[PDB]
């Protein structure tokens, strides 16, 4: 059971301040004791979404009212959501490769689903034209799973697309966020939108630990009202874990962590490459690691993703394929997510990576 | 800003063991600190389930494996996922009065829903003969919100109906199960089910905190494989709240609570139906008393339920009335929960419900 970790699911915990978190939760419980034997607001406690709302108007640029926001035990439950605020017959288009997760979720629903390759720039707006769809699912920060940034130029055009009709939606999910290594960080399409065509979408599994289950979502004045007239919702997210994630907010023990796990997160990818490259003697592709916890490589072998995937499992290494994340030849590609991933295993995992592309 | 509560969506806080419930979130913490990095499995940490399991075994004698639970972060996103596993084109059957929510959401996912009046032995076999529904909704240890207990020999009946013929399905909602006062306490319809045709529901919102928002539900092997080919599901409850759970099970915290509780509501209710009947000099009809954290009282006035619901809210009374739970005269009929009901509130309560129901 000496497992090393590649995946893109997870987050560090060996520097997370579990400590800080718990001072946090009990100061948070003192203080609102008496509201924790009723229920949350049915969109999440009104001071934690104004907490959420600060934050993300200073690092993402998003601009709204804590009253648009709706919290969110996981992206799926607020999609879910969603897509009942939306039009029913509505075309949703998602990126292709995406997270096939949510394309099972929306197809599972009846929903008609489009794909939309990609280009340097990220979803193609090319493409999207030409398909004419309703409803766009795209991840700009870091494209899940290529890692593709999109630029500001592809964000006016996504933007100008759904402007120039109505009814065309675009939900940007902004999974893998907080950290962007050398290129500055953009705005997000929330923040550039003009039209209001925008839901945003976010979540702290990253920033934080997946098993909090806390995420949210950003709804247009309209879509806000379609909401608020449906009035049976209730709300998913543990009323301690909102009231803790404010303290932890507001007492800027957030800010201390991102600082801190920026550093270390940028420091740990920038060794984990060198000693790939190293070890496959540089017959390594490497792709979409400018941004994102995880990124992408091409090996250069004539063993096939699945036999790959086969004899990593056998050597304790957790690691997924791209062919994970199809909708719908010679390179091998996988998906190398390094958040979990120990520091002392960085060469014993990049090790035991290459007996599995090779076999020795 | 001094409020009273007559609520029944409420815990009461005062005697709820919080430092113990931190404790073991601490304890819990460290020993699996390692998997909070990663997502729980789809249907909950098995061990969770595993203790939910032996509990549920012990005190409503419901039979079954932990792999065919699923966790649970309301009863709501639980129902929502249920209606996914029947048959898309069911009919369901509710209780009438009965839970609003559960309505409008089986409602607004374009399902036929039938009502179904009650007796006083609780949901009427003989309306839902007649009806010929496909899946019954029941809430068996007390109904919501009428408080009526069903007998074992109305639950038989509802169990011979679902075992005639087959696509015919029980959900049992087991809410407010865990406080039988001066009666026995019943077994599940799930434990003397023969043929597999029960999904049991049950929820840690009374006898906990509902803003820890964890739920659990039961399901037949046929509706277990369902489940299993849908892949794409994510868990909803936080998983430190689920490792906390499973440690104040196995610690005999729980038990220990449950014990205590038992004893304060008991008493607490007691002695708000003796205020109750003093202050209105026994001129108030008091049902379904027996089990649960709420009961029923009819007042005999000439003033309607809405202008007393009206008049208790400038005496910052929280209550609500019997029309609340309306799916489809001169005895006004409100709920009167008791759980987050401070004792020392009694007398004061009473005393304002006296001057909302006639004026003075
Ligand atoms: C594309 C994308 N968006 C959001 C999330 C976060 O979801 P939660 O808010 O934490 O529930 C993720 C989730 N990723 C883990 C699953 C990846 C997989 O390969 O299945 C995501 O990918
Ligand atoms: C009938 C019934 N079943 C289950 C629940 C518990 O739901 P959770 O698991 O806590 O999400 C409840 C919920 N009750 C509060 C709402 C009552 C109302 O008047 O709206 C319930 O009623």
Redesign the interface.
Known sequence: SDWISF?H?????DH?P?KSW?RC??KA?SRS????????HPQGIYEVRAAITRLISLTRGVKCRPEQMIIG??T??LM?LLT?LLPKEAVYAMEEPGY??MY??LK?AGKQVKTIMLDEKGMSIAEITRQQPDVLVTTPSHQFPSGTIMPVSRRIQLLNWAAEEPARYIIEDDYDSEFTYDVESIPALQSLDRFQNVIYMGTF?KSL?????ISYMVLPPELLRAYKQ????????????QLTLQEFIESGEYQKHIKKMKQHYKEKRERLITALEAEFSGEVTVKGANAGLHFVTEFDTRRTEQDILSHAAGLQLEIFGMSRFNLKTGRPTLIIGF??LKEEDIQEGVQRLFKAVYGH
Chains 1, 2 share one sequence.
């Not at 004791?33 to 949350?40: E, H, R, V």
């Not at 630990?209 to 289950?213: K, S």
């Open positions: 995946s699911m997870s987050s560090d915990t997370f579990i718990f939760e009990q419980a004791y008496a509201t924790l034997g009723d229920m949350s035990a996981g799926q439950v879910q009942e096939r997760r099972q979720l599972n599994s630990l997946p098993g909090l289950r449906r009035g049976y919702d209730l709300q998913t997210c543990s009323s301690l874990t958040a979990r």
